[PDB]
Symmetry: D2
Subunit: 343 residues, 4 copies
């Protein structure tokens, strides 16, 4: 496979099944079933059609099963999944409430909302891991903290510090990242619902009521459509890379200390002690410091909708969040190997 | 010169002398003067030395202009300005208070504080012009926004919208970036005060007091030393690219509108293209301040210096873009069909 | 899945199973086996051990089946496939010939050489499609080259041009890229044979002779080891982004021509979105981001750097894949263009 | 100033006045003058107009000085220097021969040609220096390359290698870049001459011959216009970065041998140069992406793509100039390698 993150043997190191299944094709589809189920619900709520009309759709989709073979033909002809998906969803709905699934929505609405739902789940996992790592890193500090360390400034031997002083550089920003993450989790995971041209034209002055209700049913923030406004994505991608950068600084520190060898002991048995995990921390930092540029180039999205900037997001964002989760997984592993800090 | 922002003729497009003066040698020097004046006052307040010793530093460095040749030759000897700067700074203070300048401080303290101080002025200017352009664009939205527009999704003509619909996409994210900038400027501009190896080993228990009071006097946040913690710099740089990126979308919309040419009137759209340019510039440059997150040990020259090479041009590109978008808005005689 | 190239549905636009198969574990292992077979042959040729011992290493590996699950645990602990891979390869060899596999070689030697063998097969596929695309675009440029276009400069109408005039900007850079690819293929796909810390300390004075034999046997180039020297990788990745940039320039032109919609006729019934056209711009921008990672990994410190080296693992296959997809997508695009010009 | 390469104090570390001089406004205006001079001559020679007219243009421009203030104003008005420049250049020329200056040519023709003119001189200084450094690192190696080193693989102590071993990862990639720059310098620096939309439509049938002669006088390659074909720039940008990236590897190693401090010795008055090389390497590795994002230049001219090269490329060549200067300072400090 292309990415080490999913590779049959390289995921020995780079793996993260938990994060990666959020970006599985079944996970994506299931959120698009949840979008189309809630949209009918919200429209019945806001008097666009009746309730036994919405129930007809809701239990049609109940258990819907996608034909992955025809969906792939769907992105062949269309560039996009949703025409084919909707086409099958309608065939899954008895009567002529079938005509009314997807009403008022566009392909970007459902795709980006799906993305948002799963980014939300992904950030929860990341936060929990971040909290747990801060604690792990704190446990090291409370064990070895008063022990002396030789300072190193601009690649030279500096005056003596302590273990807790150097470890303040590992823990303190991770703590700030956890704060940034939880601030973002309030507003950031948003309903995408703009319709064909971003004006919700199939709903008139009922657009507001539908958007609010559909957002509530999906556990997502209500803000008006953001088809070309990719700031939120970019901002998110920045904290994903913020996390990898700090962890990479910690990895580089651990590797350096191992090469000098006098003030760290690593473990594995009860022996080569290659700081592979430490090195992999640097690699993941550098990867995400590259990928963040994709997400920023993708702020320039012309007109009402832009495939060129939107697809660059598809190419790159999932690997950024996976870089972040794997860096958390790898750092937690490196810390378990650190048996002594200090002289 | 290498950069079109500062270039003797290319500045007619890319210039922004107001944001650039903030990165001059003189504005850096003056901010470093404000660091050591105030550091002396903070330590006098703390009771480390006396009080006429601080008063000597404060007024000794009141008329201070530095020999730049020697400064350059000092970074040519050291890699870093401050050991020579401090030498001249010491020669202007009479008596034993000359010994006390820079006490407890390192080079990274004075360099990073100076930067934060000038970045804060930079961010105010930026915040103002951003607030202004929201009003300028909002004006065009209420002047012209009743008018029909051919909508365009994925490079094909779609259903009709109005000017007010498309204007929303330019305005709304800018009001988000004002909000993001105002959130950041509460305490994103920090004092750097760590000492040689980030432990303020010269101050003892008094480290706490001095650091709070030195931050107080400079209008900077009191966050514990962040020599190898550059998370906030990267966050700040992200904001800088957020604005350029939104204005780049706006430049792109105006360029496409000019090319089709039946739903805009402009008084050829050089300004619109430059918005796309500056957007992609900063979108590249954001990478540099993320590769500089990996700052090894207690001080990395490698990571730190990459910030000297990239950060000003991020801020200037945001400044300039804010200037250029305003010139573009003034060019717009009409949005919408006839 | 994570990349759209490999994704269960999105592959229907971003997919390229032919190029991607060259990055699958099965094809990677098969290159590694190939390296280890030829290594054994080359040492016994310079007479480091016996021939029917090397011949035991040949035929032992001929039926070899990897424990995929144990290979995984192998990089979990070691960080690299090879110590375990070699351990499974010794299980595949009967007799004291099993002591002689991977003699003189290091972990990076097998990995980098395995990549080089595979990059060679990708580049021959890329170069093949490139030449055919130039030929297809050349047929667009002959059908409609006489018809006039409105010139556009700096997002404004300029003077009249012809279709041939604007087609030259799609075709001429591709012909130059084809030439760049053929040139690179002569030396650029090297052997990696350095040993534990680059100097082939096991081999002694048989160093150069064995490396030459190993290079000839595997159809790669006889250069000294380049554990910490990644300039050829960077130079190749630049080529990958050069192709995508130009095809991006192509796809953007077609996208505008479709928006204005008077000087083009696109076909099928796929509305009528220029999806393939936009995709071309996307892939161009992708590789244009990625190329910087390959450049960040030029700084590989000391005798071997895990940090620099693993960054290449993360990013490089997606560069070759994007370039390969770009050629497919451009080919599909041009097959939808029925008329350029008024 | 915005960049440390030009900075009143920081250029004590990052300065290259000799590379930076090629990017000055004066040295640019000089190049563009040469373009219009050579254009008029090439047009007289291809019989587009008469000798007497071409000579009036030559002698007008021979004592021509530019109004910088009005040029500044001119790009504020037009987005580009040339219209004002050409307007100023017509005033230098007497008679109706003034109408002929700039004939057939467009703003990008004179701008990109000028870039190409100065980049060729950048690349000659860079090649020369690169050859000289290759020598210094070789003098360094054969002085000390019998002395053993502790090898280091993936940040752990490995077996014994010698000083010459490690130095091959320094010298052998720089020798390949010298060859790459040599190769590029043959037909890599190209005359840009296409006209309003790239079709040289003013020149009719004489286009090839005007262009060939225009290219010959300016010492640049004759090739068809590349107003939207920026792969020559991209390739040159790759070369720049390749150089700084190898020098970055060199610096990183030197700093690690400095930190360990047992298998090196530095005459100092430590490893600032060593870290600077790493800085310039990760800088160029950043910038290379802009030049690659600039490959997408739409239609017959794209201001947005084109002006990204304006922002980034002068600093890439300067970083490559400075990295070379900086490695040469560092190499002059190393008195011993090995135990
Ligand atoms: Cl220091
Ligand atoms: Cl901070
Ligand atoms: Cl190893």
């Amino acid at each position: 496979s292309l990415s080490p993150f999913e590779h049959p043997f390289l995921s020995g190191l780079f793996g993260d099944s938990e994060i990666i299944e959020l970006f599985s094709a079944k996970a994506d589809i299931d959120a698009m079933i949840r979008f189309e189920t809630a949209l009918a619900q919200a429209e019945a709520e806001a008097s666009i059609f009746a309730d036994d009309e919405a129930e007809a759709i809701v239990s049609g989709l109940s258990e819907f099963a996608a034909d992955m073979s025809a969906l792939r033909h769907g992105v062949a002809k269309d560039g996009v999944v949703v025409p084919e998906l909707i086409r099958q969803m309608r065939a899954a709905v008895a009567g002529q409430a079938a005509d009314k699934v997807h009403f008022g929505a566009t392909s970007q609405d459902v795709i980006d909302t799906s993305l948002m739902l799963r980014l939300k789940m992904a950030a929860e996992i990341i936060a929990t891991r971040l909290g747990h790592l801060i604690d792990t890193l704190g446990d090291l500090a409370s064990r070895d903290g008063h022990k002396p360390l030789t300072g190193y400034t601009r690649m030279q031997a500096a005056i003596g510090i302590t273990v807790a002083d150097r470890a303040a550089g590992w823990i303190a920003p991770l703590e700030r990242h956890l704060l940034r993450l939880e601030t973002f989790a309030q507003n950031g995971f948003a309903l995408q619902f703009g319709g064909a041209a971003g004006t919700l034209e199939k709903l008139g002055d009922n657009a507001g009521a539908v958007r609010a209700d559909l957002a509530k049913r999906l556990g997502l923030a209500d803000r008006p459509q953001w088809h070309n406004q990719r700031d939120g994505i970019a901002e998110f991608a920045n904290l994903l890379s913020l996390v990898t950068g700090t962890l990479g600084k910690f990895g580089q520190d651990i590797a350096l200390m191992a090469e000098i060898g006098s003030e760290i002991r690593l473990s594995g048995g009860g022996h080569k002690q290659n700081p592979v995990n430490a090195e992999t921390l640097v690699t993941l930092a550098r990867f995400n410091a590259v990928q963040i540029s994709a997400l920023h180039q993708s702020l320039v999205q012309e007109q009402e909708r832009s495939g060129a900037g939107w697809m660059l997001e598809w190419l790159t964002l999932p690997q950024m969040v996976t870089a972040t989760g794997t860096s958390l997984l790898v750092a937690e592993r490196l810390a378990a190997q650190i048996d002594r800090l200090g002289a």
